[PDB]
Amino acid sequence: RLVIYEREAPEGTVKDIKEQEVYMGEIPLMTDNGTFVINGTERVIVSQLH
Amino acid sequence: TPEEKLLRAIFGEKASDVKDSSLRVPNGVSGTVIDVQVFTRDGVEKDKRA
Amino acid sequence: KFWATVESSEHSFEVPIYAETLDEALELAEWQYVPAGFEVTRVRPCVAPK
Amino acid sequence: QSQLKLLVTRGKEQGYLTYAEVNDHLPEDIVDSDQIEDIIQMINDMGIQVMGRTTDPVRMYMREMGTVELLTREGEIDIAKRIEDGINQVQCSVAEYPEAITYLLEQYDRVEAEEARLSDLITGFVDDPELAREKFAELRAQYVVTRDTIKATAQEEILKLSEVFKQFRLVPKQFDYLVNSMRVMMDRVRTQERLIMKLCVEQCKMPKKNFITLFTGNETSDTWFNAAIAMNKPWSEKLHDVSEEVHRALQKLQQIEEETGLTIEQVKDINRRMSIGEAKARRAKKEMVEANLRLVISIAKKYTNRGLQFLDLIQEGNIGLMKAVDKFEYRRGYKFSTYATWWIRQAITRSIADQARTIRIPVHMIETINKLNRISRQMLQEMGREPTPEELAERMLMPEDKIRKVLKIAKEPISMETPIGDDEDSHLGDFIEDTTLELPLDSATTESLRAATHDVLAGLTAREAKVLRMRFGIDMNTDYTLEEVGKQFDVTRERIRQIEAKALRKLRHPSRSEVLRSFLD
């Protein structure tokens, strides 16, 4: 939601656009087996220890 | 070269304008083909096998 | 000159200290060694039969 | 108040130092090998490390320009005034040189004679071919009126000559050549002057006090030579020995008074005046640039990551600023800031367009790529993934098939030393195969084939072998034309062409042909 506040507050908005669900990226999904697929290949992300 | 030109002249063999880059089975491995896939660029006409 | 035996850290070694007296050699050794956190163990005069 | 403790303290607080820093500060008694090499072990046991002027010129330049005082609104007018006073002085110095006018007239004689163009001789005068053809005749007229006044009335016309010559805006190259010609002429004058001088003071034994006395104002005549040596002076009678050389070399000295149309007295004055003007000019202009050095940096901070270093940007931009100072006129009222800004920015952009690439591409190529880069932005999330490779240039004003090539060459080459997988010493270029190399197997087969073909050629007749070798490059340089073969073979033409076909047939049968047959793989 992009809100443009009217100059010299109290802050109302002159206008605000709700523009619909802007697509940013796709994200990898984990298989029911706890694995991903990066390219055509099952991938595993090892849990770290720090 | 000169000797090659003599060879071409005697045996009358057209030297192709095209080199053979074909994918051939690696030396020593003998399998059986269980599948084939053809990926074509979008906008390029598909071949017969594809 | 005079060989001053300095020992610190994991190991020891001897360093040349020039001076006109054994006592002076010791003072010049310490003044030029101790304050760095280096221990001064020994002071020996240079022999060298000639 | 310890040297060692100071060394170790720096090497403790910081913790971490380099060999050189340790070598800088060492005990008064330690200069030698085992006395350091062990001290390192001492130090590398605790606080372990081994390996004003900050160097990097980003600082030093910033400070050195940080010294220069910023100008004032009025000060700019002062400096520009100094500029105007400076330049036009050398312009007048040019206008007062006869050869400078005559050269222009002659070159224009070459223009109307179709031996050269107008663009090389002029940029226009105060402003058309006809108007040029006339104005030039005006110049020529004011020349031909002053040419006959060489007889106290001439100083009046020389003014107007200067006036009409000044009305010409010369091509910078030509003007440069004129100035060069003048100064070179002066260097010749100095050649003769010094030659004559060294034959008196440096050889003939005579003071420069007395030498310049009768020298100034004549130098051409014998008033100081033939009327001098008899004066009964200690340096007088000594002048007989070299009296030949000076008198022989004087001819060119008085010849310059002809070629240039000016006495030796006047030449030096004119050229010196020009030098004064030029020096004055550059003296003001530099001072103009140094004040505006900050603007360049402020602009260059925008162009940083485009593939050129900061200092490269600020230097090219500095060149732009120099151009701005060269082409600026305060009389136009245009603010020098907002003016020079565009120049600096132009130099920067134009330079980045060039030297930021391993493979340098033309400007219109860079622009054309830029437009595609911009178009690919809007359709990015608009198409849900990204616009198809064959949909970009539709909005562009070109055949649209360029997108491939344009997208291909544009990509910069990858560093050959780029670390590849395994994170080892393995690098990309280490895996680059040599294709241009001829594999040893083939190189052996070639030798074997040479020997083979030689053997097969040893089987034919002497003339068949000779002509078949001659038709090709076999065991010879530069395979010969079928006519040339005959020329060396006596009987010529269709004769030779037959033997060829007669040879090939004899070598066609699977007896002689079977040996090299297998080479046909």
XYZ file of C-alpha atoms in Angstrom:
671
model
C 0.000 0.000 0.000
C 1.541 3.277 -1.157
C 0.239 6.149 0.955
C 0.980 9.781 0.127
C 0.485 11.998 3.172
C -0.917 15.489 2.689
C 1.727 18.155 3.243
C 1.728 19.873 6.653
C 0.419 17.242 9.109
C -1.972 16.063 10.855
C -1.337 13.140 8.545
C -4.129 12.179 6.224
C -3.456 10.754 2.784
C -4.095 12.746 -0.382
C -4.285 9.348 -2.010
C -3.129 5.798 -1.353
C -2.904 2.976 -3.880
C -3.555 -0.620 -2.834
C -2.068 -1.918 -6.085
C -2.627 -5.608 -6.192
C -0.112 -8.176 -4.916
C 3.005 -7.046 -6.768
C 4.880 -10.189 -7.728
C 8.413 -10.336 -6.390
C 10.287 -13.550 -7.087
C 9.234 -17.153 -6.723
C 10.437 -19.172 -3.756
C 11.499 -22.847 -3.648
C 9.113 -25.272 -1.965
C 10.064 -28.232 0.206
C 8.926 -31.706 -0.849
C 6.960 -33.952 1.518
C 10.299 -35.716 2.036
C 11.999 -32.583 3.348
C 13.910 -31.864 0.147
C 13.933 -29.120 -2.474
C 14.414 -29.177 -6.225
C 16.819 -26.575 -7.605
C 17.262 -27.822 -11.124
C 15.525 -30.982 -11.917
C 17.333 -32.383 -8.880
C 16.392 -33.030 -5.268
C 18.328 -30.714 -2.965
C 18.891 -30.752 0.790
C 19.674 -27.789 3.032
C 21.704 -28.948 6.022
C 20.692 -27.497 9.387
C 23.588 -25.488 10.802
C 25.063 -25.241 14.293
C 26.481 -21.948 15.562
C 47.369 -28.502 -48.194
C 49.070 -29.535 -51.474
C 49.108 -33.267 -50.683
C 45.507 -33.065 -49.499
C 44.536 -31.159 -52.649
C 46.174 -33.898 -54.716
C 44.197 -36.456 -52.711
C 40.937 -34.579 -53.318
C 41.744 -34.276 -57.021
C 42.541 -37.975 -57.452
C 39.734 -39.484 -55.374
C 37.167 -36.775 -56.130
C 35.738 -36.346 -52.639
C 33.768 -33.212 -51.779
C 35.057 -31.731 -48.538
C 32.012 -30.959 -46.425
C 31.431 -27.453 -45.083
C 30.119 -29.036 -41.907
C 32.039 -30.636 -39.014
C 30.552 -33.521 -37.016
C 29.842 -32.447 -33.432
C 27.360 -35.258 -32.746
C 26.797 -36.668 -29.268
C 28.058 -40.235 -29.145
C 28.118 -42.770 -26.310
C 31.198 -42.358 -24.058
C 33.876 -44.999 -24.586
C 33.360 -48.155 -22.537
C 29.775 -47.674 -21.367
C 27.107 -49.889 -22.924
C 23.517 -49.166 -21.948
C 20.020 -49.351 -23.379
C 18.126 -46.169 -24.198
C 15.117 -45.871 -21.893
C 14.037 -42.330 -22.814
C 14.586 -39.254 -24.980
C 13.655 -35.613 -24.369
C 13.717 -32.664 -26.761
C 13.787 -29.094 -25.469
C 13.071 -26.491 -28.135
C 13.550 -22.728 -27.912
C 10.233 -20.885 -27.949
C 9.796 -19.589 -31.513
C 11.960 -22.234 -33.178
C 10.154 -24.879 -35.242
C 10.140 -28.358 -33.702
C 11.714 -31.230 -35.639
C 10.018 -34.484 -36.652
C 11.144 -36.641 -33.715
C 10.217 -33.879 -31.269
C 79.299 -8.015 23.458
C 77.085 -9.977 25.839
C 74.605 -12.763 25.169
C 71.456 -12.228 27.199
C 69.193 -15.225 27.642
C 65.554 -14.162 27.344
C 62.691 -16.574 27.991
C 58.995 -15.960 27.368
C 55.943 -17.540 25.727
C 56.422 -21.207 24.777
C 60.227 -20.995 24.434
C 63.575 -19.260 25.033
C 66.562 -17.787 23.158
C 69.681 -15.630 23.411
C 70.036 -12.121 22.014
C 73.200 -10.016 21.658
C 73.394 -7.071 24.053
C 76.270 -4.653 23.526
C 77.721 -2.837 26.544
C 80.934 -2.044 28.418
C 80.056 -3.967 31.606
C 78.304 -7.186 32.687
C 76.115 -5.132 35.045
C 75.577 -2.517 32.343
C 74.787 -5.375 29.965
C 72.140 -6.612 32.398
C 70.591 -3.160 32.802
C 70.584 -2.516 29.051
C 69.093 -5.994 28.596
C 66.220 -5.549 31.043
C 65.493 -1.945 29.996
C 65.380 -3.218 26.440
C 63.507 -6.447 27.366
C 61.424 -6.700 30.584
C 58.840 -3.942 29.906
C 57.503 -5.794 26.821
C 56.385 -8.653 29.059
C 59.550 -10.636 28.403
C 61.412 -12.320 31.254
C 65.168 -11.861 31.585
C 66.710 -15.142 32.702
C 70.479 -15.084 32.200
C 73.371 -12.804 31.172
C 76.639 -14.177 29.783
C 79.851 -12.429 28.632
C 81.154 -13.258 25.135
C 84.309 -15.371 25.263
C 85.799 -16.256 21.791
C 89.436 -17.337 22.247
C 91.349 -15.394 19.589
C 60.859 4.912 26.995
C 61.614 1.586 25.447
C 62.078 0.837 21.782
C 61.198 -2.860 21.965
C 58.205 -2.241 24.210
C 57.037 0.366 21.698
C 57.304 -2.156 18.865
C 55.459 -4.833 20.859
C 52.911 -2.294 22.132
C 51.949 -1.307 18.626
C 51.955 -5.028 17.893
C 49.628 -5.634 20.850
C 47.098 -2.822 20.861
C 46.633 -3.261 17.093
C 47.612 -6.786 17.745
C 48.579 -7.164 14.166
C 51.567 -6.015 12.107
C 53.728 -6.637 9.028
C 57.441 -7.594 8.629
C 58.437 -4.087 7.556
C 56.848 -2.408 10.597
C 58.855 -4.730 12.843
C 62.029 -3.983 10.854
C 61.368 -0.257 11.278
C 61.636 -0.503 15.064
C 64.344 -2.849 16.335
C 66.662 -2.984 19.386
C 69.795 -0.856 19.012
C 71.867 -4.043 19.251
C 69.877 -6.157 16.775
C 70.805 -5.711 13.120
C 71.420 -9.339 12.026
C 69.744 -12.536 10.800
C 69.159 -14.728 13.866
C 68.565 -11.599 15.929
C 65.419 -10.776 13.960
C 64.269 -14.173 12.633
C 64.039 -15.336 16.275
C 62.447 -12.093 17.525
C 59.655 -12.856 15.064
C 59.114 -16.213 16.754
C 59.095 -14.341 20.066
C 56.383 -12.031 18.780
C 54.500 -14.698 16.811
C 54.044 -16.529 20.115
C 51.912 -13.687 21.570
C 49.911 -11.170 19.521
C 50.588 -13.244 16.420
C 50.717 -11.728 12.930
C 53.089 -12.143 9.956
C 52.966 -10.889 6.376
C 49.430 12.318 7.209
C 50.218 10.312 4.085
C 47.765 7.410 3.812
C 48.996 6.728 0.284
C 45.811 6.404 -1.756
C 45.607 9.530 -3.969
C 41.880 9.844 -3.253
C 43.149 11.590 -0.122
C 46.144 13.572 -1.380
C 44.235 15.022 -4.333
C 41.307 15.927 -2.077
C 43.663 17.759 0.285
C 45.727 19.441 -2.438
C 42.537 20.791 -4.010
C 41.248 21.377 -0.495
C 43.864 24.115 -0.235
C 42.597 26.219 -3.168
C 40.328 29.114 -2.153
C 36.805 29.177 -3.596
C 36.101 32.037 -6.000
C 33.640 34.903 -5.655
C 30.887 36.023 -8.033
C 32.963 39.094 -8.883
C 36.296 37.257 -8.849
C 35.168 35.166 -11.807
C 34.789 38.407 -13.750
C 38.297 39.437 -12.670
C 39.827 36.177 -13.887
C 37.828 36.213 -17.135
C 38.942 39.810 -17.667
C 42.542 38.680 -17.241
C 41.765 36.007 -19.833
C 40.397 38.473 -22.396
C 43.311 40.861 -21.858
C 45.671 37.926 -22.242
C 44.433 36.276 -25.444
C 43.476 38.872 -27.881
C 46.968 40.259 -27.197
C 48.539 37.238 -28.915
C 45.867 37.547 -31.591
C 47.042 41.097 -32.296
C 50.607 39.786 -32.191
C 49.603 37.421 -34.992
C 47.869 40.188 -36.948
C 51.053 42.292 -36.906
C 53.064 39.538 -38.605
C 53.264 39.956 -42.422
C 53.816 36.263 -43.159
C 50.694 35.503 -41.116
C 48.601 37.566 -43.526
C 50.392 36.395 -46.670
C 49.976 32.766 -45.603
C 46.225 33.271 -45.270
C 46.060 34.929 -48.689
C 48.081 32.132 -50.330
C 46.056 29.366 -48.701
C 42.952 31.120 -49.977
C 44.574 31.184 -53.410
C 44.754 27.416 -52.938
C 41.082 27.317 -51.926
C 39.764 29.048 -55.052
C 42.156 26.909 -57.111
C 40.479 23.762 -55.740
C 43.618 22.501 -53.989
C 41.892 22.540 -50.570
C 38.571 23.207 -48.821
C 37.154 26.163 -46.881
C 36.594 24.285 -43.615
C 40.363 23.919 -43.232
C 41.110 27.623 -43.820
C 38.216 29.225 -41.839
C 35.329 28.754 -39.403
C 33.716 31.931 -40.751
C 34.790 35.469 -39.905
C 32.420 37.291 -37.555
C 29.686 34.902 -38.686
C 28.059 31.814 -46.804
C 30.458 31.006 -49.694
C 29.863 34.256 -51.610
C 30.109 36.420 -48.491
C 33.364 34.589 -47.809
C 34.647 35.146 -51.341
C 34.010 38.878 -50.900
C 35.201 39.427 -47.294
C 38.425 37.660 -48.287
C 38.833 40.218 -51.070
C 38.344 42.925 -48.439
C 41.228 41.427 -46.465
C 43.363 41.199 -49.603
C 42.543 44.832 -50.395
C 43.596 46.091 -46.972
C 46.782 44.085 -47.522
C 47.539 45.537 -50.960
C 47.005 49.085 -49.692
C 49.546 48.665 -46.875
C 52.011 46.770 -49.078
C 53.028 49.923 -50.975
C 53.462 52.158 -47.911
C 56.836 50.650 -46.919
C 58.363 54.079 -47.675
C 55.961 57.010 -41.518
C 52.562 56.856 -43.231
C 52.410 53.058 -42.922
C 51.800 52.849 -39.170
C 48.344 54.253 -39.945
C 47.347 51.520 -42.421
C 48.937 48.678 -40.432
C 46.224 49.324 -37.835
C 43.421 48.663 -40.323
C 45.309 45.632 -41.635
C 45.304 44.289 -38.090
C 41.597 45.123 -37.875
C 40.554 43.170 -40.959
C 42.848 40.247 -40.133
C 41.349 40.111 -36.636
C 37.847 39.779 -38.085
C 38.745 36.272 -39.275
C 38.068 33.284 -37.047
C 40.736 30.819 -38.131
C 40.586 27.058 -37.740
C 42.392 26.327 -34.425
C 44.872 24.057 -36.217
C 45.850 26.834 -38.639
C 46.214 29.425 -35.870
C 48.416 26.973 -33.980
C 50.556 26.492 -37.097
C 50.920 30.268 -37.462
C 52.062 30.758 -33.866
C 54.446 27.824 -34.276
C 55.901 29.327 -37.459
C 56.503 32.622 -35.662
C 58.241 31.103 -32.641
C 60.347 28.866 -34.909
C 61.432 31.941 -36.862
C 62.448 33.454 -33.529
C 64.481 30.312 -32.804
C 66.304 30.825 -36.113
C 66.985 34.436 -35.148
C 68.468 33.066 -31.923
C 70.543 30.566 -33.915
C 72.224 33.334 -35.894
C 72.463 35.667 -32.886
C 74.141 33.016 -30.735
C 76.447 31.944 -33.559
C 77.617 35.543 -33.989
C 77.846 35.990 -30.207
C 80.051 32.962 -29.484
C 82.523 34.099 -32.148
C 83.253 37.211 -30.096
C 82.764 36.587 -26.377
C 83.271 32.814 -26.138
C 86.125 32.667 -28.662
C 87.435 36.035 -29.860
C 87.794 37.389 -26.308
C 85.496 40.401 -25.903
C 82.966 41.567 -23.273
C 79.200 41.280 -23.681
C 79.009 44.838 -22.352
C 80.753 46.208 -25.444
C 79.351 43.556 -27.791
C 75.672 44.456 -27.344
C 76.518 48.180 -27.448
C 76.655 48.504 -31.243
C 74.666 45.293 -31.742
C 71.194 46.542 -30.803
C 69.590 48.515 -33.626
C 71.723 47.226 -36.487
C 73.167 43.699 -36.261
C 72.751 43.475 -40.064
C 75.150 46.214 -41.148
C 78.935 46.431 -40.831
C 78.736 49.527 -38.610
C 79.511 47.257 -35.651
C 81.906 45.116 -37.690
C 83.921 46.921 -40.377
C 83.812 50.235 -38.489
C 84.657 48.570 -35.164
C 87.702 46.272 -35.320
C 90.032 49.222 -36.047
C 89.119 50.887 -32.715
C 92.398 49.883 -31.001
C 90.773 47.968 -28.137
C 92.173 44.872 -26.373
C 89.145 42.960 -27.667
C 89.285 44.721 -31.039
C 92.368 43.371 -32.828
C 91.375 39.863 -31.705
C 88.331 39.969 -33.997
C 90.318 39.424 -37.204
C 90.562 35.644 -36.838
C 86.842 34.828 -36.969
C 85.885 37.814 -39.145
C 85.079 35.442 -42.019
C 82.548 33.269 -40.159
C 80.387 36.050 -38.685
C 80.224 37.922 -41.991
C 79.262 34.705 -43.807
C 76.544 33.841 -41.277
C 75.197 37.405 -41.276
C 73.589 36.885 -44.694
C 70.772 34.751 -43.281
C 70.360 37.201 -40.403
C 69.555 39.980 -42.865
C 67.614 37.470 -44.984
C 65.105 37.062 -42.147
C 64.411 40.798 -42.463
C 63.228 39.962 -45.974
C 61.341 36.675 -45.507
C 59.390 37.975 -42.498
C 59.269 41.555 -43.772
C 60.422 42.810 -40.376
C 63.744 44.045 -39.012
C 65.433 41.781 -36.450
C 64.552 44.416 -33.849
C 60.810 44.092 -34.512
C 60.563 40.283 -34.743
C 61.767 39.612 -31.198
C 59.391 42.308 -29.918
C 56.332 40.835 -31.640
C 57.010 37.234 -30.642
C 57.932 38.210 -27.075
C 54.673 40.160 -26.852
C 52.811 37.069 -28.045
C 54.592 34.970 -25.414
C 53.541 37.466 -22.739
C 49.929 37.266 -23.878
C 49.850 33.467 -24.023
C 51.437 33.193 -20.589
C 48.948 35.700 -19.167
C 46.061 33.713 -20.640
C 47.103 30.310 -19.288
C 48.004 31.969 -15.976
C 44.364 33.166 -15.520
C 42.692 30.052 -16.943
C 44.471 27.584 -14.644
C 43.402 29.727 -11.697
C 39.854 29.464 -13.041
C 40.003 25.652 -13.155
C 41.587 25.140 -9.722
C 38.681 26.999 -8.123
C 36.124 24.770 -9.840
C 37.901 21.469 -9.122
C 35.227 20.605 -6.503
C 32.310 20.594 -8.946
C 34.058 17.851 -10.911
C 34.156 15.570 -7.874
C 30.542 16.354 -6.991
C 29.519 15.300 -10.506
C 31.793 12.253 -10.666
C 30.262 10.836 -7.481
C 27.210 9.920 -9.591
C 29.100 7.880 -12.202
C 31.163 5.752 -9.764
C 30.147 2.131 -10.431
C 29.920 2.359 -14.226
C 33.264 0.576 -14.561
C 35.729 3.411 -14.080
C 37.734 4.346 -10.983
C 36.852 7.441 -8.942
C 40.038 9.297 -9.863
C 39.655 8.400 -13.538
C 36.204 9.985 -13.447
C 37.400 13.109 -11.650
C 40.344 13.475 -14.050
C 38.331 13.121 -17.264
C 35.844 15.464 -15.635
C 38.737 17.814 -14.908
C 39.525 17.774 -18.628
C 35.885 18.641 -19.261
C 36.209 21.548 -16.841
C 39.294 22.696 -18.749
C 37.303 22.671 -21.988
C 34.583 24.660 -20.223
C 37.122 27.271 -19.111
C 38.433 27.414 -22.684
C 35.060 27.959 -24.396
C 33.411 30.179 -21.757
C 32.661 33.896 -22.082
C 31.459 35.919 -19.079
C 29.943 38.534 -21.398
C 27.070 36.141 -22.124
C 25.934 36.310 -18.505
C 25.581 32.531 -18.298
C 26.484 31.226 -14.837
C 29.791 29.366 -15.079
C 28.639 26.660 -12.653
C 25.550 25.409 -14.501
C 27.498 25.846 -17.742
C 30.654 23.874 -16.918
C 28.519 21.200 -15.225
C 27.321 19.923 -18.600
C 30.879 19.925 -19.972
C 32.316 17.917 -17.081
C 29.383 15.503 -17.197
C 29.894 15.176 -20.961
C 33.597 14.339 -20.628
C 32.802 11.793 -17.907
C 30.022 10.020 -19.830
C 31.959 10.083 -23.117
C 35.009 8.574 -21.406
C 33.063 5.853 -19.572
C 31.451 5.013 -22.903
C 34.928 4.232 -24.144
C 37.431 2.865 -21.643
C 35.206 0.888 -19.246
C 35.101 -2.089 -21.623
C 37.593 -4.817 -22.512
C 35.912 -4.913 -25.901
C 35.263 -1.293 -26.825
C 31.946 -0.651 -28.540
C 30.733 2.466 -30.423
C 28.595 5.068 -28.639
C 25.388 4.408 -30.581
C 25.787 0.756 -29.617
C 25.923 1.658 -25.918
C 22.855 3.863 -26.305
C 20.991 1.187 -28.276
C 21.772 -1.318 -25.512
C 20.635 1.158 -22.857
C 17.218 1.553 -24.483
C 16.695 -2.229 -24.446
C 17.783 -2.360 -20.805
C 15.139 0.265 -20.050
C 12.369 -1.472 -22.001
C 13.108 -4.770 -20.235
C 12.327 -3.062 -16.912
C 8.658 -2.234 -17.472
C 7.635 -5.670 -18.748
C 9.530 -7.517 -16.001
C 6.732 -8.111 -13.485
C 4.149 -7.033 -16.062
C 4.529 -10.286 -18.002
C 4.514 -12.271 -14.754
C 8.045 -13.579 -15.252
C 9.909 -11.519 -17.852
C 9.261 -10.393 -21.448
C 10.064 -13.031 -24.084
C 13.488 -12.576 -25.755
C 11.819 -11.843 -29.095
C 9.586 -9.210 -27.546
C 11.639 -6.106 -26.852
C 12.459 -4.145 -29.999
C 8.845 -3.925 -31.192
C 8.814 -0.508 -29.515
C 12.252 0.180 -30.972
C 12.616 1.787 -34.415
C 14.750 -0.964 -35.968
C 14.365 -4.425 -37.680
C 14.199 -6.088 -34.208
C 16.442 -9.035 -35.143
C 19.322 -7.183 -33.476
C 18.265 -8.169 -29.945
C 20.303 -11.376 -30.068
C 23.594 -9.890 -31.290
C 23.161 -6.805 -29.125
C 22.529 -9.005 -26.080
C 25.486 -11.221 -26.990
C 28.582 -9.059 -27.481
C 27.478 -6.660 -24.722
C 28.339 -9.146 -21.970
C 31.840 -8.562 -20.605
C 34.270 -11.509 -20.693
C 34.692 -13.524 -17.494
C 38.026 -13.247 -15.673
C 40.198 -16.165 -16.748
C 41.568 -16.395 -13.209
C 38.041 -16.811 -11.827
C 38.072 -19.613 -9.235
C 35.978 -22.564 -10.399
C 34.406 -25.280 -8.224
C 36.219 -27.259 -5.499
C 37.542 -23.864 -4.304
C 41.028 -25.178 -5.095
C 43.808 -23.670 -7.208
C 41.649 -24.842 -10.107
C 40.800 -21.774 -12.174
C 38.585 -21.319 -15.227
C 41.404 -20.757 -17.710
C 43.166 -23.882 -16.497
C 40.297 -25.813 -18.083
C 40.483 -23.957 -21.398
C 41.461 -26.491 -24.045
C 43.773 -25.595 -26.905
C 41.849 -26.122 -30.136
C 44.300 -24.277 -32.384
C 46.925 -26.928 -31.623
C 47.471 -29.762 -34.088
C 47.306 -33.077 -32.226
C 50.481 -35.226 -32.557
C 48.596 -38.146 -34.122
C 47.426 -35.992 -37.029
C 50.862 -34.378 -37.316
C 52.349 -37.856 -37.708
C 49.717 -38.935 -40.234
C 50.590 -35.816 -42.229
C 54.264 -36.794 -42.423
C 53.352 -40.362 -43.365
C 51.028 -38.990 -46.044
C 53.822 -36.767 -47.366
C 56.135 -39.759 -47.701
C 53.310 -41.810 -49.226
C 52.323 -39.249 -51.867
C 56.021 -38.815 -52.646
C 56.322 -42.566 -53.222
C 53.249 -42.585 -55.467
C 54.762 -39.688 -57.424
C 57.994 -41.658 -57.756
C 56.075 -44.245 -59.776
C 54.899 -42.008 -62.678
C 57.036 -40.768 -65.573
C 59.504 -37.945 -64.905
C 57.316 -35.490 -66.818
C 54.077 -36.796 -65.284
C 55.559 -36.451 -61.811
C 56.945 -33.011 -62.673
C 53.643 -31.746 -64.094
C 51.491 -33.236 -61.331
C 53.783 -31.739 -58.698
C 53.659 -28.470 -60.628
C 49.860 -28.441 -60.847
C 49.781 -28.577 -57.055
C 52.060 -27.317 -54.295
C 53.718 -30.719 -53.984
C 57.318 -30.448 -52.761
C 57.359 -26.882 -54.095
C 56.365 -23.334 -53.197
C 53.456 -21.588 -54.972
C 51.482 -24.066 -57.124
C 51.597 -22.820 -60.721
C 48.799 -21.873 -63.125
C 48.120 -24.365 -65.936
C 49.593 -21.897 -68.439
C 52.726 -21.287 -66.354
C 53.224 -25.049 -66.151
C 53.409 -25.095 -69.930
C 55.692 -22.055 -69.900
C 58.218 -24.044 -67.863
C 57.322 -27.200 -69.808
C 57.966 -25.779 -73.300
C 54.923 -27.124 -75.204
C 51.912 -25.414 -73.658
C 48.125 -25.052 -73.240
C 45.685 -27.949 -73.686
C 48.704 -30.251 -73.772
C 49.460 -29.949 -70.040
C 45.809 -30.129 -68.977
C 45.694 -33.516 -70.692
C 48.690 -35.030 -68.886
C 47.076 -34.028 -65.597
C 43.951 -36.036 -66.400
C 46.264 -38.742 -67.749
C 48.122 -38.934 -64.442
C 45.014 -39.024 -62.237
C 43.689 -41.988 -64.221
C 46.893 -43.985 -63.758
C 46.720 -43.207 -60.048
C 43.006 -44.058 -59.924
C 43.399 -47.848 -60.073
C 43.474 -49.959 -56.870
C 47.164 -50.789 -57.210
C 48.837 -47.392 -56.986
C 45.714 -45.886 -55.393
C 45.277 -48.461 -52.624
C 48.179 -47.179 -50.519
C 46.816 -43.672 -49.887
C 43.186 -44.814 -50.143
C 42.908 -45.341 -46.381
C 43.682 -41.635 -45.885
C 40.132 -40.973 -47.118
C 38.604 -42.048 -43.774
